[PDB]
Design a protein around this ligand. Structure first.
Ligand code: SF4
Lengths: 603, 287, 167
């Protein structure tokens, strides 16, 4: 009954959108209606995804409000599950987010984006996939702050549908069918063709944010709202990744250069995103480059899977796919944690620059603990949920390192070395982020005036962090659940890792020095926190603390050629009409035209 | 399945300031002075445990709670390193990625504790330590990765008994990876004044000294127990245990002595550590 | 702000609480085998500084008795004060006093630190180090010989006893 569940979920999403738009004359009631509708629709979406994943078969039917053909493969059930979780918690966050005198009623665009994303996940036609991913993308463009930020994203988004429309026309000419099961059963006879696959991969990476086509991501995540940016990073990226995965797995056939190309592409995405996140002092733009690097890690897992299905190694396929999809779900979880918590910090303070955002850990300690969990989850630290997917991806890398191929053995340990680079850089970046935001003395009078977080904001972020911890410690019980979608044995190289014993050994081991200091203390006075930091005799000043500007200097010191390569490959001055007076307003003017003419032809 | 890892962690915790004490008395004898005793580190640590911890007003729970976290993370490390058998006490936790990212946990908590205080010196030291971790983690990953693909499995107690029974057919990938791991250990135990602990005081400073001594133990132990296993057991017996403890403490003592000697005998070793690591990686690919 | 004053505003030596000052003997027998000493050089000539740094030199050693020089007041159990308290140096010396964990041991080193020395009655000094902070052990000399420094630290740690008395 997952078809009826997803039908009711899409119905509640569109009802929430139209009711939030109809009652837009006030902010509180419109936000309440939009959040409740999004929450119940996401509950139905997650219920349908869990039903499909537990059935492990795959269901098909017809959505009887668009006349929409639907197939829910168990591979897409993970996308439905993560969309349901993220949508439910972002809607519950939006309930309290829509009580501010500075924010806007975004519930119509939020609900339309989630409905388009769900219809894109559950799509069976590739043309309908493009159309619904294109509805979601224009709603996301409308979901930005102003017309300046949604200009490069509009250009890259329409470049992507030009590419995806050409690829879909090529597929319709070659096969006479746009369906996905029909293409899979027809791709035994003729293989995909590099010309269609590379075009589709570039067109989806324009949507999935793949370096060097990543220029829209931090500009879009510059000053957007946290309910906007959370589902941006956890929906818009994952739809393009789903399109890449459903183009790469369109047949058992898959040439070896596809997997190597995906490995190199996700590799440079992970490295460049993780390096470029270090040199930024805006939290919501830093999270965009960390989106880029974790999407690179998920693409590393998917490229390992594609290389395995090229080399006919079932263990490699199993390891690559579940590592990639588990890291996809976990990344969406803790990225929602990070974006919603940073938005709560902005909600209580008003600042997004971490240079002018210190001392928030004492003002809001619940939010501070939640971001500590999220930062330790994103920088892959055991036993949290960002470590398990990286562990399975490393196991797939080791399976690559032992397979018989010169293109795979040369690429085996290099991916491990660079993923160690990326993990260490992420650990540094989140050490910097937690140090200069939630620790130390505040650096602005606007910071100490920030009271505690609201009720439902804290409830949503704590529930997301609870889900992150649950997905972390219960990885050995959730990985075989994802083995029901990618369907075959998981074969780590003679090794398991067990998150519960690390969890038990990280709470019980620090008790031993506590017991020892409780025994070895004699006349120990109670600990005092009174004075200022020791700065060698002179008194302490606000200009003397080291912050994100001075903490990210040796990475600018040692990784200088890549950061100068940022400035070189920037063809922004070569576009003739890019410097126009009204080009930003013109793109948003045809955006109203394009969404109005493409929605009505579907209906 | 509980007693062996717990006794492993407890003994490796309780023997850690011997290695710091022997290192500081070796540095004293190398500079032609008599120097302190080998038990001076214990006296300093217990005396600091007597004192009471102070900190800045802006410091919160992270500043007080970091040293216990770092000691517990080093204990979770040390409970999976084999010191007397070729089999790790906890093979579930005794992977390669697990140990690396638990060391990443330690680096992250040290860096956020250095940034918690308002002192520029502690934040600078946190940044330098994080730089050191960024430059050393893939070196050691590639070293034990070459050793792992020589072995067949991503797991301690598989690399250890692969290098225990020397195959004599892939000896060059083993030797180059061994020297790369030695270089990574040399970088981690060393640099490669004010200090990053200038804001710690009392019990917090004592538990930081505990954690630093335990980190310097477990890095050298991950070298000399994984890559020098001749003297350990395939299966745990009750009669050959004294020989295993003797050879383990002798290995640790000679390791800290020779590392102190070659530290005082001093991006060359940073590049050569990467260079011997890639020379290991090319060696399997060419042969 | 940092230090107590009179009605005129002249600084006075700090008074520790007796709860804080009650466990000084226990602190001394705790740090008898390991003493962490921070030099707090104030307004004085290098003589009273180089000789203190010569207590860990080849001729006279301090680590054999357990004394180790620390880089921060937070690590310090003994605060070694050196020079006569210059008006520009009272505030950093007070800051080094409050930065150390309670209880503390203070040792005045040299004539200039004990009472001001030759600059005892002068507008830019406050006199000796006892005019700003309490002092437990006084070590005279200008400069004190390293034998006197070792005797002062050993008598502070209880390894030796006081030799000279008043007449
Ligand atoms: S005691 Fe003598 S040597 Fe020391 S600072 Fe005073 S005048 Fe100089």
């Amino acid at each position: 009954s997952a078809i009826s569940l997803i039908n009711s979920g899409v119905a509640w999403f569109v009802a929430a959108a139209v009711l939030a738009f109809l009652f837009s004359f006030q902010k509180a009631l419109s936000g309440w209606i939009a959040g409740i509708g999004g929450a119940v629709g996401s509950l139905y979406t997650a219920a349908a995804g869990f039903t499909v994943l537990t059935g492990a078969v795959g269901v098909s039917g017809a959505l009887s409000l668009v006349s929409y053909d639907v197939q829910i493969s168990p591979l897409n059930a993970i996308w439905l599950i993560t969309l349901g979780l993220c949508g439910l918690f972002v809607s519950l966050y939006n309930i309290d987010w829509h009580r501010h005198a500075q924010v806007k009623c975004n519930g119509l665009q939020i609900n339309m984006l989630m409905a388009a994303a769900v219809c894109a996940v559950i799509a069976s036609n590739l043309g309908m996939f493009v159309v619904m991913a294109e509805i979601m993308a224009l709603c996301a463009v409308f979901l930005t702050s102003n017309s300046k930020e949604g200009k490069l994203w509009f250009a890259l988004g329409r470049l992507g549908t030009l590419l995806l429309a050409i690829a879909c026309w090529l597929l319709w000419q070659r096969y006479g069918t746009l369906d996905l099961r029909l293409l899979d059963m027809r791709m035994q006879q003729l293989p995909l063709g590099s010309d269609i696959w590379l075009l589709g991969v570039i067109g989806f990476g324009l949507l999935a944010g793949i370096i060097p086509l990543h220029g829209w991501v931090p500009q879009a995540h510059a000053n957007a709202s946290a309910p906007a940016a959370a589902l941006f990073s956890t929906v818009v990226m994952k739809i393009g990744l789903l399109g890449i995965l459903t183009l790469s797995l369109l047949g058992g056939n898959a040439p070896l250069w596809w997997g190597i190309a995906l490995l190199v592409l996700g590799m440079i995405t992970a490295f460049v995103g993780g390096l470029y996140a270090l040199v930024e002092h805006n939290i919501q733009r830093l999270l965009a480059y960390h989106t880029l690097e974790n999407i690179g890690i998920i693409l590393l897992g998917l490229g390992a899977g594609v290389t395995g299905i090229a080399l006919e190694q079932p263990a490699l396929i199993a390891l690559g796919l579940v590592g990639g999809l588990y890291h996809l779900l976990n990344h969406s979880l803790f990225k929602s944690v990070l974006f919603l918590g940073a938005g709560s910090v902005w909600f209580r303070t008003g600042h997004r620059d971490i240079e002018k955002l210190g001392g928030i850990g004492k003002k809001m300690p619940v939010i501070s603990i939640a971001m500590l969990v999220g930062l330790m989850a994103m920088a892959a630290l055991p036993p949290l949920n960002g470590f398990a997917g990286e562990w399975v991806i490393y196991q797939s890398f080791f399976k690559l390192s032992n397979s018989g191929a010169f293109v795979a053995r040369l690429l085996g340990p290099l991916l491990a070395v660079g993923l160690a680079i990326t993990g260490a850089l992420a650990v540094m970046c989140m050490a910097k982020v937690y140090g200069v935001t939630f620790l130390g003395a505040p650096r602005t009078k606007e910071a100490e005036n920030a009271t505690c977080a609201p009720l439902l904001m804290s409830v949503s972020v704590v529930a997301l962090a609870i889900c992150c911890v649950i997905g972390g410690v219960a990885a050995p019980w959730l990985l075989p659940m994802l083995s029901a979608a990618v369907p075959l044995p998981l074969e780590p190289a003679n090794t398991t890792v067990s998150q519960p014993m690390i969890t038990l050994l990280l709470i019980a081991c620090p008790l031993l020095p506590f017991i020892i200091m409780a025994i070895c203390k004699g006349d120990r006075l109670p600990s005092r926190s009174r004075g200022a930091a020791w700065v060698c005799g002179y008194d302490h000043e606000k200009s003397m603390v080291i912050t994100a500007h001075g903490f990210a200097m040796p990475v600018k010191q040692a990784f200088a050629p890549v950061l100068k390569l940022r400035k070189w490959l920037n063809p922004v001055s070569l576009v003739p009409g890019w410097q126009c007076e009204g080009s930003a307003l013109l793109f948003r003017r045809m955006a109203l035209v394009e969404l109005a003419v493409l929605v009505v032809i579907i209906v | 399945s509980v007693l062996y890892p717990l006794i492993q962690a407890l003994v490796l915790f309780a023997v850690a300031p011997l290695l710091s004490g022997i290192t500081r008395v070796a540095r004293a004898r190398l500079h032609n002075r008599r120097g302190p005793g080998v038990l001076q580190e214990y006296r300093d640590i217990i005396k600091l445990l007597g004192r009471q911890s102070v900190g800045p007003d802006a410091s919160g729970w992270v500043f007080r709670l970091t040293p216990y976290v770092m000691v517990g993370v080093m204990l979770t490390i040390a409970t999976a390193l084999p010191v007397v058998t070729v089999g790790s006490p906890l093979p579930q936790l005794g992977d390669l990625i697990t140990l690396l990212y638990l060391f990443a946990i330690a680096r992250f908590f040290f860096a956020i504790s250095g940034l918690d205080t308002g002192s520029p010196f502690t934040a600078i030291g946190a940044s330098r330590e994080a730089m050191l971790g960024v430059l050393v983690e893939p070196m050691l990953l590639l070293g034990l990765w070459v050793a792992a693909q020589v072995a067949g499995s991503t797991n301690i107690s598989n690399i250890t008994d692969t290098v225990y029974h020397w195959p004599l057919s892939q000896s060059i990938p083993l030797v180059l990876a061994l020297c790369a791991c030695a270089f990574a250990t040399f970088i981690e135990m060393g640099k490669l004044q004010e200090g990053p602990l200038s804001e710690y005081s009392g019990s917090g400073f004592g538990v930081m000294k505990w954690g630093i001594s335990l980190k310097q133990l477990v890095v050298l132990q991950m070298f000399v127990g994984v890559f020098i296993p001749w003297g350990q057991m395939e299966t745990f017996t009750a009669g050959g245990l004294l020989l295993a403890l003797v050879i383990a403490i002798v290995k640790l003592v000679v390791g800290v002595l020779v590392i102190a000697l070659f530290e005082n005998s001093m991006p060359r070793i940073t590049w050569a550590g990467f260079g011997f690591a890639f020379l290991a990686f090319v060696s399997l690919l060419a042969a | 702000l940092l230090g107590p004053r009179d009605a005129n505003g002249i600084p006075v030596p700090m008074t520790v609480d007796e709860s804080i000052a009650s466990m000084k003997a226990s602190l001394l027998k705790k740090i008898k085998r390991s003493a962490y000493v921070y030099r707090v050089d104030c307004g004085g000539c290098n003589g009273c500084e180089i000789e203190i740094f010569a207590t860990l030199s080849p001729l006279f050693d301090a680590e054999r008795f357990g004394i180790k020089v620390v880089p921060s007041p937070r690590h310090a159990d003994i605060l070694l004060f050196t020079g006569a308290v210059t008006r520009a140096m009272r505030s950093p010396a007070l800051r080094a006093w409050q930065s150390a964990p309670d209880p503390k041991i203070c040792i005045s080193y040299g004539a200039c630190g004990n009472s001001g020395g030759i600059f005892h009655d002068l507008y830019c000094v406050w006199g000796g180090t006892d005019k700003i902070v309490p002092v437990d052990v006084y070590i005279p000399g200008c400069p004190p010989t390293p034998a006197a420094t070792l005797y002062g630290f050993a008598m502070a740690l209880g390894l030796l006893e006081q030799k000279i008395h008043a007449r």
